[PDB]
UniProtKB/TrEMBL annotation, chain A:
It is an enzyme of class 2 (transferase). Its main location: cytoplasm. Binds at least 2 Zn(2+) per subunit. This is DNA-directed RNA polymerase subunit Rpo1N. Mg(2+) binds at D458, D460, D462. The gene is rpoA1. GO terms for molecular function: DNA binding; DNA-directed RNA polymerase activity; magnesium ion binding; zinc ion binding. It comes from Pyrococcus furiosus (strain ATCC 43587 / DSM 3638 / JCM 8422 / Vc1). Its EC number is 2.7.7.6. GO terms for biological process: DNA-templated transcription. Zn(2+) 2 binds at C97, C100, C144, C147. Zn(2+) 1 binds at C57, C60, C67, H70. PANTHER family: DNA-DIRECTED RNA POLYMERASE, DNA-DIRECTED RNA POLYMERASE III SUBUNIT RPC1. Belongs to the RNA polymerase beta' chain family.
From TrEMBL, chain B:
This is DNA-directed RNA polymerase subunit beta. GO terms for molecular function: DNA binding; DNA-directed RNA polymerase activity; ribonucleoside binding; zinc ion binding. PANTHER family: DNA-DIRECTED RNA POLYMERASE I SUBUNIT 2 (PTHR20856). Residues 166-339, 415-479, 512-573, 594-626, 1007-1097 form the RNA polymerase Rpb2 domain. Keywords: Cytoplasm, DNA-binding, DNA-directed RNA polymerase, Metal-binding, Nucleotidyltransferase, Transcription, Transferase, Zinc. Gene3D superfamilies: 2.40.50.150, 3.90.1070.20, 3.90.1100.10, DNA-directed RNA polymerase, subunit 2, domain 6, RNA polymerase alpha subunit dimerisation domain, RNA polymerase Rpb2, domain 2.
Length: 901, 1101
């Protein structure tokens, strides 16, 4: 019954086609009468359609929202050149004879080039090259070979002006202008047998059609007038331009009928050509664009199809959609990673159409009884005939009893529904994922915290959109392909993207660190909070004084791991490689060490798990953090996505409880260095400044050694920067060593939860050099940055070296230099975002339609083979073991531990 | 010896005496005083095409802010009256017409040429010179600084454009073509002409002139200006042997031209191809007259000075070629000049008055032609009076100010004044905007120049694409206004300068420039600059004069123009500051003012040019004999919002920028006039508080009278998972007791328009008969006069003002329902209802609805240290932990953002707030002179607490103390106007746009969310084809069409005959149904609107 568009073939409309497809000829340059009805024969004639309410289009009946529209046409008094085809017209004219109209080529050469063209001309670039060669060959012949006649050169003047350099008496040219009628007559007599040599097609196009004599009129529905709030019709730009065109055409016809002087007719012809070329393209090169009454440039047909707001990119590749909601986001760690909290206000506004079946009749009946105001209600019912009824308080019970098999109910959202959950900009494919609905009282979307990294979202005012699929197939696609737990492993590098962040890692470290112990109530409460289905506590690890039992953090954490997991590695807390080397030796000598032997050598820097029992090490970003996650990566591959989801939920909740009930804070004393450290830092800074001063003094008397390839000044600058960077690193070396593991900021930095050592060394010891675009500050007065320094001073302080820390405070010059430094980062991000976006758009448009075939090859839509095996090994990067096609070591090790057990 | 506190005592007097909006008020006053007369004198007078008749202009004056009542007479107008009535706060302009008959003048006649909008609190405004008890009775806020315009009831503020300094020779390298270019922008009567002289690889100089197709030969164009002698060329350019050798080469290359007439004819050929010889000659001499450096004049006698200026430009180019001088460095401030309100208004008045004089001349010509001659000559007074059309001037000026579109291509000069709070308004009144394009990188222009010190705030800048292009004046900044140029020139001449016409610039002689134009030469430059400095400090000449000398090039620059940015400094003489302790005492007692200190030679303003020769010390205790000036107050280099942050030097620069930007968005009692204000949006914090830790500048600027935040008891602790990733947790009991509780305002407007033909709207209850009649439910709160009762609670889409409109001719005998209703998702209580009359006498009704906004989830809170977040959870009080000293946190923040953000200043403010609240008095948090951290830490220990600021807390659930000591203090926090109640938005089906038949745009009209092409690419990357088609067709737009497969053209379905047929080919047998998007059908129609013919090939399945 229903057919689909299989292919589209383009071409050029002939005057006969335009005349036949038209519904009316336009003759009056007006739109509406005084009262408000369309003027008969006007640019708003009802033949083209109706846009005003309560009007029937006589062409096809209909109404304002029903009539699709019909084309009109204008009979131009004299032909004009189409601006889009002017360059092609020039290409054609200088390549064909003026008399016979044949291509100015020799017959055997024509045969050779026809043989060449048929060799797969479908490739556009090669066809263009061949046509360019033909044009170049035909340009350089003054005499037609087919018939005896001289050929004058033709000069093209933009936008649509053609000059003919024809000689005269006493051998002088007068650059005759070619009128459009002459050009059309020249083009008309071109035979079809050599049209392919010109790049045209005898059927889809003709050279004489490129000079148009009848201009089609777009339908009224394509030119919707807006009734302004003042009560005055705001005409669309196209309608106004059409009115101008009709007025000029009428004046030209009247003048021609009246025998006007030749110059007047020529001027009117040029004016009509200008109006037409502006209507087709108002941004055509070489013309002054037409302007509105307000002085703004008009928008015409060419403008609608171009730009980010144009048709192709604004209403075709993307558009505004129904059944969508947008509001701010707020954290919620108590829901599963594949669930989203939805406001009750949104849930009662969005609806999911559902069909009545034998297994859901009672629930739909109850919802229909609930009405559109109770939360689990409905807003509309659709009978099997297809009529839409709105549920109202007077219709609840009657419609509920009318409900039967085959009806449709537009119920409110429920728990367990599937929705699309999106953040902009959509940089990569896991920017949109499917979540399970969980209704909430307040007015913000609730998002689990482990799902933040894929969305690149933080709760500082970000807004994220939600979409509800309306059809069963779309819901199935969202449920199967787009579930959050499916996309734990990133396709970019084969590593986890969803994982613990910040407090998760910090709480894990607090729980699994050496010396951590918990009481009976703490263990029971934290296990119940995490959701673990335990019914009997394990044996106490140690007994406190007064006889109280105590449990270590390792034992509690081990209850979340799968029963048979085994792995060992080195985490970011490794500081004494001998301790790790001893454990590695003990594990290597026998693949199953005695746990009571490992516990004697247990060290926080070396994680080792034996049959689900955590025997050494501490939680770190390598444990389950997104970038370095190993336990999560092993679990998701060896046990499926659901077990990974359960593990992730349990560990997140457990670490959150630990960090809540143990207490975790930072204060002003976290950077309180002892006096000896401050003295050491001042010593380092003074030594660096003295070295810089010595270098400058050596430079000022020409004793400096010029480094290869560089100017002497550049060598001095590079040496100074090297010295300053070395000084800052040396200060950081002692700043790190004096702040021990007991400091909460150091815990946050070393475990990778937040920040790095640079922040600590800047806050506690030294800011260091400030530079813009990789070079020292120079953009001030002549020879100096600030007027507070002597001109010509090259010292470290005078060029941007800040010797203070954020804690000790910055002098005004240091503050100004720091602002200079920060501005460069701000502008760098501002420009880099746009550049990256444009490059990504180019890449997307280049590589969009490639796909893997059933035979394993990657083929272009035209059938061209790009790869004979995707990625040359056939392995999906998402499913790869961190780039590797397969991890042989892990498989061998796990098999051996499984069987040796 | 003076101390920084003594310097602060002097510093605050500057703001006390001058204010904060001097840049607008002084410029507008100068405009009103002189610019109108200057522009009038420029035109001279009307020259109608009437025999033996002419009109000469006289004086111009401004009347008083008035308004011509339609059914009445002129009456006084006040700003609050104009705001409510949507009028224009303007005053009439009166001009004198002097009739000239037979070349003889007679008695003048004064006519009204239009209305000029009045800047608020200017010397011609009614509010000027009034006291606080009078401003209060007039409805104004005494704290209002003025300095803006009121156009049709909206507050328009003109920002200052940052242009290149006029008449400045800037030299740059054209490395692309390996050339050297010097550029000047010559200004005369507003017109700008970019004139450039360049040296290409050939070593030959060429001159670029406006309205000239290709660059002409330098020697040729110089010959065209007379001075044809080759020796004259060599002397005009310079005297250096290498310079004269290069000029010998150029002259040899230019031996082709002979006389000035040949050059004129050559330029005529250049400018007017194909025309008669005389026409080209005359119209090329015209170009020489008024396109080649017009600022030198347009007289034919001005040849010699123009030639000398061009020769000096060429000398600069060749000197750059030889490496004798460096690049211009146009980023330097000496090359930058601000375009104040007065200059722009002068330009607008110039263009409007040009239009007006054209219209007047046309009118008088028409009247003489059509009435006759004896009529016009019998009553000249009537003939002149009834021919002026003031509306032509008024409409253009009003539209240009309202829209922000300026003649000459300038856009965005006039912006809507921001009225969110005190800081936002004051910061908006002090902005400098670069005219560049935002989209380009512009790495050199966005950077913070070294000369910005003390002239532009280093931190207060926008965040997005405008970063670095929009900047705010510092507190020390002062903007000059031009003095008469001729007096300065004569004074400089009397000091011993010989005119340039006398002797050539011998390198033994210094060059002297006055506002960029060479005026003579002196033997010693340093003696001249010392001589001028002595007079400037003594008081012999105006203070706006700045003088600087460049030793290397032997040039002396004297600046007296308009728009320079300067800063005050204490003059240091022989290692001793001129400011003494008794001067500070006199300033404190009120005996001595800031202007007196300026006139006493103690403090002088330095622009960028003069500061090149200075050597300024930072602090009084580091001054030595080398220093020439002393910094008044280093903490005042920051902008106004940036001064709010306490201890700004302890935070990273990006965080300070974020805090300064967010300080303009927080709620608070912005103005005491808010109750009767008619702003579109408004806010009101219920219990604003003064910050406990504050900078002493904020009290001086008046911020403490209008605070915009509250003090919170903040504990840094990871209470749960509900505060991660910059989320915050707030106490429920404190919210219920009035913490951060706010009120939201919104004003609706309704006009009773009067249409042509006598039809008009009407306020009434809509009858059920009228079309568009919405449910009777929505008229529940209306009175019989058609207006809502105040203090009645309303809901979404409830009707506020009932109004019916004349019908539309498709019906007839109907009345459209055009009531004004509440926005679809808003709610509140009607606060006040106002009935007024518009400028045309039609009734105007304005209704404001207030809404209580209790804090909830998703509301945004931000401290002034750049730390921002949203409320993640609201916790009952008994669940919150409590300190063992009896304190319960008002707010809990995550300790994780602190190390990454590196905002130590917030941690210091936390200690300072509790120290201030415990000692009973506030703590000073000035930028570089605030109370040091070590003092506060010791004082906290003195009061009995621990010096680290850590207290022992007990868990609110388990009832046992936490293992670690918790940092707790008091921090100033601000509620931002980004409330979730205004951001939530959901669309079920909604209405659709007319053209594309897709969902509308925006929350206000039930619009739909944008589904961008990037989302489509994401969907494709997931491989979900059916999800993509569902999102892209059914939810947005889809339709069925009839396609004739024989020819591919879309067939026509006729609803008259129940028949489908193809018009283009007459086919009825094969018309298949096709399903496609409506937008694609529109695309096909657009292509068929051109000559494109897209054929459609159908297929089965
Ligand atoms: Mg964010
Ligand atoms: Zn129709
Ligand atoms: Zn031929
Ligand atoms: Zn057909």
């Amino acid at each position: 019954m229903k057919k689909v568009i299989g292919s589209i073939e383009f071409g050029i409309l002939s005057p006969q086609e335009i005349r036949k497809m038209s519904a009316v000829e336009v003759t009056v340059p007006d739109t509406y009468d005084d009262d408000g009805y369309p003027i008969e024969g006007g640019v708003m004639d009802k033949r083209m359609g109706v846009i005003d309410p309560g009007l029937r289009c006589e062409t096809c009946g209909g109404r304002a929202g029903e009539c699709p529209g019909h084309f009109g046409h204008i009979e131009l008094a004299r032909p004009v050149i189409h601006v889009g085809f002017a360059k092609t017209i020039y290409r054609i004219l200088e390549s064909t004879c003026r008399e016979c109209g044949r291509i100015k080529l020799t017959d055997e050469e024509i045969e050779e080039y026809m043989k060449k063209i048929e060799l797969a001309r479908n490739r556009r670039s090669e066809f263009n090259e061949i046509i360019k060669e033909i044009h170049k060959k035909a340009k350089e012949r003054m005499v037609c070979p087919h018939c005896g006649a001289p050929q004058y050169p033709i000069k093209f003047e933009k936008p649509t002006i053609y000059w003919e350099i024809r000689k005269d008496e006493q051998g002088n040219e007068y650059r005759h202008r070619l009128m459009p009628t002459e050009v059309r007559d020249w083009l008309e007599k071109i035979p079809d047998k050599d049209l392919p040599l010109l790049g045209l097609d005898p059927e889809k196009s003709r050279p004489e059609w490129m000079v148009l004599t009848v201009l089609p009129v777009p339908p009224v529905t394509a030119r919707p007038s807006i009734t302004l709030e003042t009560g005055i019709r705001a005409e669309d730009d196209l309608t106004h331009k059409l009115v101008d065109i009709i007025r000029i055409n009428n004046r030209l016809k009247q003048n021609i009928e009246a025998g006007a002087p030749q110059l007047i007719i020529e001027d009117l012809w040029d004016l009509l050509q200008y109006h037409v070329t502006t209507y087709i393209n108002n941004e055509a090169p070489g013309v002054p664009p037409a302007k509105h009454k307000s002085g703004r440039p008009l928008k015409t047909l060419a403008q609608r199809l171009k730009g980010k707001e144009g048709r192709f990119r604004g209403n075709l590749s993307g558009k505004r959609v129904n059944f969508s909601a947008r509001t701010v986001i707020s954290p919620d760690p108590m829901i599963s990673i594949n669930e989203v909290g939805v406001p009750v206000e949104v849930a009662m506004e969005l609806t999911v159409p559902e069909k009545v079946t034998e297994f859901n009749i009672e629930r739909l009946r109850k919802m229909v009884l609930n009405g559109p105001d109770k939360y689990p209600g409905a807003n509309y019912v659709i009978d099997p005939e297809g009529r839409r009824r709105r549920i109202m308080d007077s219709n609840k019970e009657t419609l509920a009893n009318q409900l039967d098999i085959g009806w449709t109910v537009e119920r409110h959202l429920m728990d367990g529904d599937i929705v699309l959950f999106n953040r902009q900009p959509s940089l990569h494919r896991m920017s949109i994922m499917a979540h399970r609905v969980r209704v909430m009282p307040y007015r913000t979307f609730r998002l689990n915290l482990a799902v933040c990294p894929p969305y690149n979202a933080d709760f500082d005012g970000d807004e994220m959109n939600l979409h509800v699929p309306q059809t069963e197939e779309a819901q199935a696609e969202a449920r199967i392909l787009m579930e959050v737990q499916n996309h734990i492993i990133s396709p970019r590098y084969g590593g986890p993207i969803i994982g613990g962040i910040q407090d998760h890692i910090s709480g894990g470290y607090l729980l699994t660190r050496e010396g951590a112990y918990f009481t009976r109530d703490e263990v029971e409460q934290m296990l119940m909070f995490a959701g673990v289905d335990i019914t009997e506590l394990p044996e106490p690890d140690k007994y406190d004084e007064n006889g109280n039992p105590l449990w270590s953090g390792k034992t509690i954490f081990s209850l979340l791991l799968p029963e048979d997991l085994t792995v060992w590695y080195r985490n970011k807390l490794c500081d004494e490689p001998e301790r790790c080397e001893a454990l590695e030796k003990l594990i290597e000598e026998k693949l199953m060490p005695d746990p009571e032997e490992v516990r004697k050598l247990a060290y926080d820097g070396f994680v080792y798990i034996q049959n689900g029992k955590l025997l050494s090490g501490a939680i770190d970003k390598k444990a389950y953090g997104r970038e370095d996650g190993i336990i999560l990566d092993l679990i998701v591959r060896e046990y499926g996505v659901e077990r990974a989801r359960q593990f992730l939920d349990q560990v997140t909740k457990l670490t959150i409880w630990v960090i809540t009930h143990k207490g975790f804070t930072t204060g002003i004393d976290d950077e309180d260095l002892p006096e000896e450290a401050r003295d050491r830092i001042r010593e380092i800074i003074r030594e660096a400044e003295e070295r810089v001063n010595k270098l400058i003094e050596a430079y000022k008397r020409g004793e400096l050694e010029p480094l290869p390839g560089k100017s002497l000044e550049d060598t001095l600058e590079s040496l100074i920067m090297a010295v300053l960077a070395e000084a800052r690193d040396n200060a950081g070396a002692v700043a790190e060593k004096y702040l021990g593991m007991d400091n909460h900021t150091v815990i946050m930095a070393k475990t990778g939860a937040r920040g790095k050592i640079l922040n600590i060394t800047q806050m506690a010891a030294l800011l260091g050099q400030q530079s813009i675009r990789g070079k020292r500050l120079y953009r001030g007065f002549r020879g100096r940055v600030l007027s507070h320094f002597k001109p010509g001073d090259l010292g470290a302080r005078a060029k941007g070296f800040v010797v203070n820390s954020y804690k000790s405070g910055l002098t005004p010059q240091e503050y100004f230099f720091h602002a200079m430094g920060g501005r460069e980062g701000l502008v760098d991000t501002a420009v880099r975002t746009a550049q990256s976006g444009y490059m990504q758009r180019r890449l997307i448009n280049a590589l969009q339609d490639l796909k893997v075939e059933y035979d394993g090859t990657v083929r272009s839509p035209e059938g061209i083979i790009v790869q004979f095996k995707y990625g040359e090994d056939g392995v999906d990067p998402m499913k790869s073991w961190r780039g590797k096609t397969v991890d042989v070591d892990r498989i061998i090790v796990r098999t051996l531990l499984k069987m040796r057990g | 010896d003076v101390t920084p506190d003594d310097l602060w005592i002097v510093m605050e007097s500057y703001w006390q005496e001058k204010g904060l909006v001097r840049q607008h008020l002084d410029s507008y006053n100068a405009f009103i005083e002189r610019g109108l007369q200057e522009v009038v004198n420029e035109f001279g007078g009307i020259k109608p095409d009437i025999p033996d008749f002419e009109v000469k202009f006289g004086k111009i004056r401004v009347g008083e802010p008035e308004f011509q009542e339609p059914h009445g007479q002129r009456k006084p107008l006040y700003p609050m009256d104009a705001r409510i009535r949507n009028l224009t706060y303007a005053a009439p302009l009166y001009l004198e017409m002097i009739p000239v008959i037979k070349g003889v003048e007679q008695d003048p006649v004064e006519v009204r040429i239009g209305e000029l909008p009045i800047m608020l609190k200017s010397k011609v405004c009614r509010l000027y010179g009034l006291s606080d008890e009078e401003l209060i009775k007039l409805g104004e806020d005494p704290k209002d600084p003025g300095g803006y315009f009121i156009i049709n009831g909206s507050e328009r503020v003109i920002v200052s454009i940052e242009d290149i300094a006029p008449n400045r020779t800037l030299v740059e390298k054209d490395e692309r073509q390996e050339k050297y270019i010097a550029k000047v922008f010559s200004y005369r009567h507003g017109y700008r002409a970019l004139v450039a002289v360049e040296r290409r690889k050939d070593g030959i100089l060429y001159v670029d002139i406006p309205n000239v197709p290709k660059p002409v030969k330098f020697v040729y164009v110089m010959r065209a200006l007379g001075l044809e002698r080759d020796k004259d060329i060599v002397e005009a350019v310079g005297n250096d042997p290498e310079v004269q050798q290069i000029m010998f080469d150029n002259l040899e290359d230019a031996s082709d031209i002979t006389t000035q007439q040949e050059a004129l004819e050559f330029i005529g050929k250049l400018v007017a191809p194909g025309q008669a010889r005389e026409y080209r000659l005359k119209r090329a001499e015209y170009v020489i007259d008024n396109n080649l450096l017009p600022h030198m004049g347009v007289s034919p006698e001005d040849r010699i000075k123009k030639a000398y200026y061009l020769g000096m430009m060429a000398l600069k180019v060749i000197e750059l070629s030889l490496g004798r001088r460096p690049e211009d460095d146009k980023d330097h401030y000496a090359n930058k000049r601000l375009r104040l309100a007065g200059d722009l208004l002068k330009d607008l008045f110039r263009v409007a008055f040009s239009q007006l004089v054209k219209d007047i001349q046309y009118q008088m010509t028409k009247t003489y032609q059509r009435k006759g001659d004896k009529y016009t000559f019998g009553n000249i007074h009537r003939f002149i009076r009834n021919s002026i059309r003031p509306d032509v001037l008024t409409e253009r000026i009003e539209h240009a100010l309202a829209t922000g579109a300026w003649p000459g291509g300038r856009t965005g000069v006039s912006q809507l004044l921001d009225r969110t709070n005190y800081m936002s308004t004051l910061s908006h009144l002090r902005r400098v905007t670069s005219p560049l394009d935002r989209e380009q990188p512009h790495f050199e222009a966005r950077d913070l120049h070294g000369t910005h010190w003390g002239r532009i705030c280093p931190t207060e800048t926008p965040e997005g694409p405008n970063c670095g292009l929009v900047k705010n004046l510092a507190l020390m900044a002062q903007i000059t206004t031009a003095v008469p140029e001729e007096e300065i020139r004569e004074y400089l001449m009397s000091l011993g300068i010989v005119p340039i016409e006398v002797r050539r610039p011998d390198p033994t002689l210094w060059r002297v420039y006055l506002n960029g134009v060479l005026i003579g030469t002196i033997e010693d430059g340093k003696a001249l600059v010392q001589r001028i400095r002595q007079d400037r400090r003594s008081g012999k000449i105006s203070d706006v004069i700045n003088v600087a000398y460049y030793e290397d090039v032997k040039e002396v620059y004297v600046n007296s123009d308009d728009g320079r940015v300067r800063r005050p400094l204490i003059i240091v003489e022989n290692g001793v500051p001129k400011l003494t302790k008794e001067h500070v005492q006199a300033v404190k007692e009120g005996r001595l003012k800031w202007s007196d200190l300026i006139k006493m030679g103690i403090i002088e303003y330095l622009d960028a040019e003069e500061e090149e020769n200075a050597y300024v010390a930072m602090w009084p205790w580091e001054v030595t004999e080398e220093h020439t000036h002393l910094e008044l107050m280093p903490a005042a280099i920051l902008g106004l919002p940036a001064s709010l942050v306490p201890y700004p030097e302890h935070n990273a620069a990006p965080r300070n920028t974020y805090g300064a930007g967010m300080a303009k968005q927080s709620l608070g009692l912005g103005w005491a006039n808010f109750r009767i204000r008619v702003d579109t949006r408004g806010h009101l914090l219920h219990y604003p508080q003064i910050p406990l830790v504050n900078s002493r500048i904020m009290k001086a600027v008046g911020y403490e009278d209008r605070p915009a935040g509250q003090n919170f008891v903040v504990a840094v602790l990871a209470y749960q998972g509900y505060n991660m990733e910059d989320a915050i947790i707030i106490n429920k009991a404190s919210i219920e007791r009035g913490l951060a509780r706010s009120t939201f305002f919104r004003t609706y407007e309704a006009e009773e328009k009067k249409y042509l033909g006598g039809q008009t709207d009407k306020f009434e209850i809509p009858d059920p008969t009228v079309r568009g009649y919405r449910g009777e439910k929505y008229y529940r709160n209306l009175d019989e006069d058609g207006l809502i009762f105040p203090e009645s609670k309303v809901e979404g889409k409830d009707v506020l003002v009932g109004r019916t409109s004349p019908p539309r001719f498709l019906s007839l005998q109907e009345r459209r329902e055009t009531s004004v209703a509440v926005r679809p998702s808003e709610k509140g209580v009607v606060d006040k209802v106002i009935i007024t009359e518009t400028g045309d006498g039609t009734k105007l009704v304005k209704v404001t609805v207030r809404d209580l906004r209790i804090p909830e989830l998703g509301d945004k809170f931000a401290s002034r240290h750049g730390q921002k977040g949203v409320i993640g959870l609201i916790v009952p009080q008994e669940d919150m932990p409590w300190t063992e000293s009896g304190i319960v946190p008002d707010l809990i923040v995550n300790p994780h953002g602190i190390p990454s953000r590196m905002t130590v200043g917030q941690l210091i403010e936390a200690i300072g707030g509790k120290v201030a609240s415990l000692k009973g008095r506030r703590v000073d948090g000035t930028a570089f002179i605030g109370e040091p951290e070590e003092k506060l830490r010791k004082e906290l220990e003195e009061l009995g607490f621990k010096h680290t600021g850590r207290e022992i807390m007990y868990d609110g659930i388990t009832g046992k103390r936490l293992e670690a000591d918790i940092f707790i203090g008091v921090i100033y926090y601000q509620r931002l106007h980004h409330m979730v109640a205004d951001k939530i938005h959901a669309r079920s089906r909604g209405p659709v746009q007319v053209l594309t038949k897709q969902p509308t745009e925006g929350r206000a009209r039930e619009g739909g969310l944008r589904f961008g092409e990037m989302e489509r690419d994401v969907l494709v990357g997931h491989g979900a084809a059916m999800l993509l088609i569902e999102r892209l067709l059914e939810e947005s737009d889809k339709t069925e069409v009839w396609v004739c497969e024989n020819c591919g053209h879309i067939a026509l379905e006729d609803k008259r005959r129940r028949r489908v047929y193809c018009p283009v080919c007459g086919e009825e047998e094969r018309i298949s149904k096709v399903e496609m998007s409506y937008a694609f059908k529109l695309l096909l129609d657009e292509l068929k609107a051109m000559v494109i013919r897209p054929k459609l090939n159908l297929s089965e399945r």
